Amino acid sequence: AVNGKGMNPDYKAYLMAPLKKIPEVTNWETFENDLRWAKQNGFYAITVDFWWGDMEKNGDQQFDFSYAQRFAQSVKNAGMKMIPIISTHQCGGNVGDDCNVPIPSWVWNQKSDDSLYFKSETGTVNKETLNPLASDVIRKEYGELYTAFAAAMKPYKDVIAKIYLSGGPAGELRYPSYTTSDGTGYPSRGKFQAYTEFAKSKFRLWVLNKYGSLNEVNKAWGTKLISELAILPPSDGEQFLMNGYLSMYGKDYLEWYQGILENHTKLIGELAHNAFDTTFQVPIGAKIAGVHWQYNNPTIPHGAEKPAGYNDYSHLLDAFKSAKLDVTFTCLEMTDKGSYPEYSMPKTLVQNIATLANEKGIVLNGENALSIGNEEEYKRVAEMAFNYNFAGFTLLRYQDVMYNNSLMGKFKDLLGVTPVMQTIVVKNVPTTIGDTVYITGNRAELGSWDTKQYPIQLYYDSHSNDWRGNVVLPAERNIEFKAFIKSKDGTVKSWQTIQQSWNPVPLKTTSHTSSW
Numbered sequence: 001a002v003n004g005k006g007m008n009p010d011y012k013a014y015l016m017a018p019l020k021k022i023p024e025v026t027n028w029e030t031f032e033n034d035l036r037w038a039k040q041n042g043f044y045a046i047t048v049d050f051w052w053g054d055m056e057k058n059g060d061q062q063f064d065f066s067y068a069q070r071f072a073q074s075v076k077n078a079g080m081k082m083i084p085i086i087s088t089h090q091c092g093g094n095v096g097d098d099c100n101v102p103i104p105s106w107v108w109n110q111k112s113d114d115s116l117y118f119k120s121e122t123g124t125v126n127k128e129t130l131n132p133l134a135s136d137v138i139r140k141e142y143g144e145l146y147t148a149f150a151a152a153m154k155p156y157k158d159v160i161a162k163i164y165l166s167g168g169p170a171g172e173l174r175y176p177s178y179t180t181s182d183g184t185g186y187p188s189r190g191k192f193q194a195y196t197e198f199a200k201s202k203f204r205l206w207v208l209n210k211y212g213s214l215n216e217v218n219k220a221w222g223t224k225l226i227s228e229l230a231i232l233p234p235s236d237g238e239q240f241l242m243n244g245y246l247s248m249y250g251k252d253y254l255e256w257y258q259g260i261l262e263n264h265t266k267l268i269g270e271l272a273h274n275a276f277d278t279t280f281q282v283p284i285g286a287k288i289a290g291v292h293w294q295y296n297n298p299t300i301p302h303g304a305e306k307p308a309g310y311n312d313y314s315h316l317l318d319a320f321k322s323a324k325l326d327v328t329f330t331c332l333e334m335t336d337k338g339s340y341p342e343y344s345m346p347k348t349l350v351q352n353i354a355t356l357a358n359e360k361g362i363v364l365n366g367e368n369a370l371s372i373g374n375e376e377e378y379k380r381v382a383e384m385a386f387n388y389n390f391a392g393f394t395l396l397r398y399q400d401v402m403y404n405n406s407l408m409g410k411f412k413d414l415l416g417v418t419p420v421m422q423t424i425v426v427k428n429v430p431t432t433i434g435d436t437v438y439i440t441g442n443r444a445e446l447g448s449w450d451t452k453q454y455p456i457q458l459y460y461d462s463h464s465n466d467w468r469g470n471v472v473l474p475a476e477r478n479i480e481f482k483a484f485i486k487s488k489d490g491t492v493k494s495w496q497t498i499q500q501s502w503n504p505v506p507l508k509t510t511s512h513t514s515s516w
């Protein structure tokens, strides 16, 4: 893995449940047989959306957790764990959504203004999730929902592995900047979503708060606005993405635009911890969308991420850290293209995000963006997951492998693995001052024969006078590997003579010993 390390010892595989209720897709008894089958294939838990629209349908505090409780009972019956997603977003409308569960209708009646929803640059109204600007409504409703959910799930504490929160549309922390109705679906640039009157006033007040008055704002921006009402979000979104973002005004607007998401993160994080910590004591996480198109566009750099709210990933991730939330990223199965007209760089996106999270010490989890129909994608997911310290991977979605034994078998082999600590010992390594010893092998867990950035480093044991290391390998899988020496300048000096193997890696901790 990156930086001479191996795979994450805590790595687990999870499976996403269908979007519709189980009884609408199959039956409870069959569902239980299915769970035992997934467990047989390396899946540790099933993640599942519990829709706000289902749980607080009829009115304020008129809760219904009966489905969630029944689901949990079946999970307990099958001997599995589950990861609930408190889905405060709408099901339906997003790519791959076979369902229709909008958020409770009574919610929209809580406000007379337009503070609750989104309005794009061109006046497109979005109502699939509450506007994070309305933190007063969010604090009340989410606080109430999280607290009631905790009490209802208390009896099933034992089968709950962790909790996922919904930070926005499709369960991702972002703005609904890419939609067909708004004419911003992939691979087009996105549109900013701060055009409600409420959003304009908030931006305005944020600016005057930072500067004090219009005379200071004009000084800072080098502008000549005549009144405070002239303080507005970008009039031309494309021109803004083209050059507007470079100005002090642009930097300020993007700081505020993204900041709303960071504050939201800290709020829902505080509410979640308060509601679940003392009872479940499990990790809580949220998701960041993988907006890979328009990434390397030369005229509108990152034209899709920015309108979604992602301007500075490092500062965004700092919010998760302070909120005590684990992060889930997506697109692990994709490769960089970076060509016109899509300018899609999914792999680069993932590598950078993983790097930031790892340096900040944020637990990292991954998902595939689209359904996988070939083992080649499983291979791509494996490379990223096992070399970038991912603590977990969640497969979208249930039906794909549940009804395809061939795909299920390939998943088990490549990703449904159990990490086991093993000691690799290599004798007689002809090193000189400055030389370092590494090992690389055939599987993604071993760096796939890469010697540049994925090899696993060994260390000299002054006592036993040899090179060894406590390497984490996938249990019960056949592996092939060879040790090699790297010179001080970082180049490969030589390779171990005979190729080593472990068929398979034992389930219990042992040690593989070989001579150079």
Ligand SMILES: OC[C@H]1O[C@@H](O)[C@H](O)[C@@H](O)[C@@H]1O
Residues within 6 Å of the ligand: 016, 017, 049, 085, 087, 089, 090, 091, 092, 094, 095, 096, 097, 170, 171
């Ligand atoms: O099942 C997890 C997530 O899957 C996505 O494909 C859906 O759009 C989300 O609404 C859902 O929360």
Ligand SMILES: [Ca+2]
Residues within 6 Å of the ligand: 056, 060, 061, 140, 141, 144, 145
């Ligand atoms: Ca309520």
